[PDB]
């Protein structure tokens, strides 16, 4: 998967001599519970605390 | 080689197909017999089609639709004819095919298709698959279903016929047909 | 593969031409910055391109 919270919705398809076939939309929501994110700045200068 | 139960079996069986198989002739009795190492055992082929009299020499890398008619205990099996050109153009035509069901005064019929997977194709392969489809989508050889015919159209006054009552004997199995030529198949199945 | 690399590049090329279309206007003249009256200059440049 991709480390990135979101509810993925994955739907394939299969077209073959018999016809096209829309398979069954399969959902996969990533994590929840309790997480953490960080606010790291673009730049910081040596000697800065 | 009649019956009903029987028919269901022989037509239900595992069909297989091969190529690049060149083999020299040896007659075990009447006129022929050959053999081939498929990759697992050692087969056996009884050519004796009106196309065998032009082929008592042997095979050169042809396509042979081998379906077991009867088996020995080592994986090897005898099959009749089924030989086609090779290089057989893997052109893939979609052919019309009507299927009617008779029942005294009653009629249920269908327009449908058959998938020819070659350029030239053994009437043996035709015979088999034509009935294969039938047996699973048209209830052939289950119950009263066991009488009927298969007329294949080729040109404005040419057709080949096949009684369903008794799979078409082995001598015409060496026969062969040009895919492009098949206007279409008509099958009627009475009860 | 040559006929391929050529493709790729032609593509980059169109995709990169497309950029500037945004700054084109009502009457088919181009503005310096987006939303600004259009400049005889810039429009001439875009022609040059």
């Amino acid at each position: 998967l991709p480390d990135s919270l979101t509810t993925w919705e994955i739907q394939g398809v299969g077209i073959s001599n018999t016809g096209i076939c829309v398979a069954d939309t399969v959902k996969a929501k990533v994590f929840k519970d309790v997480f953490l994110e960080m606010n790291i700045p673009y730049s910081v200068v040596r000697g800065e605390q | 080689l009649h019956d009903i139960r029987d028919l269901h079996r022989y037509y239900s069986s595992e069909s297989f197909e091969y190529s690049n198989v060149s083999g020299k002739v040896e007659n075990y009795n009447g006129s022929n017999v050959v053999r081939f190492n498929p990759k697992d055992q050692n087969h056996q082929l009884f050519l004796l089609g009106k196309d065998k009299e032009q082929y008592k020499e042997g095979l050169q890398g042809q396509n042979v639709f081998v379906v077991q008619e009867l088996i020995d205990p080592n994986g090897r099996l005898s099959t009749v004819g089924g030989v086609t050109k090779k290089n057989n153009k893997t052109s893939e035509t979609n052919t019309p095919l009507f299927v009617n069901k008779v029942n005294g005064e009653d009629l249920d019929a269908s327009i449908d298709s058959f998938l020819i997977q070659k350029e030239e194709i053994s009437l043996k392969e035709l015979d088999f698959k034509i009935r294969q489809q039938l047996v699973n989508n048209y209830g052939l050889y289950k119950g009263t279903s066991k009488y009927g015919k298969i007329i294949i159209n080729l040109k404005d006054e040419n057709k080949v016929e096949i009684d369903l009552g008794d799979k078409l004997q082995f001598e015409r199995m060496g026969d062969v047909l040009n895919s492009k030529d098949i206007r279409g198949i008509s099958v009627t199945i009475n009860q | 593969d040559p006929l391929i690399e050529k493709q790729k590049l032609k593509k980059k090329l169109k995709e990169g031409m497309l950029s500037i279309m945004s700054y084109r206007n009502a009457d088919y003249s181009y503005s310096v910055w987006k939303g600004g009256s259009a400049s005889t200059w810039l429009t001439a440049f875009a022609l040059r391109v």
Partner: protein, 49 residues
């Protein structure tokens, strides 16, 4: 707190110019997250001949 958010700080200061990368971890009654960051560090008044 329930259905909420708590905050986090790390007071830090870098010495190596442009040194990077910090594994940042959070364990909870459910498991461990290793979130990975990268910190950017820099000199003071730049120019290139």
């Amino acid at each position: 707190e329930g259905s909420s958010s708590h905050l986090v700080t790390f007071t830090v200061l870098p010495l190596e110019i442009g040194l990077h990368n910090i594994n940042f971890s959070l364990e909870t009654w459910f498991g461990k997250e290793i979130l990975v960051k990268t910190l950017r560090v820099v000199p003071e008044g730049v120019k290139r001949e």
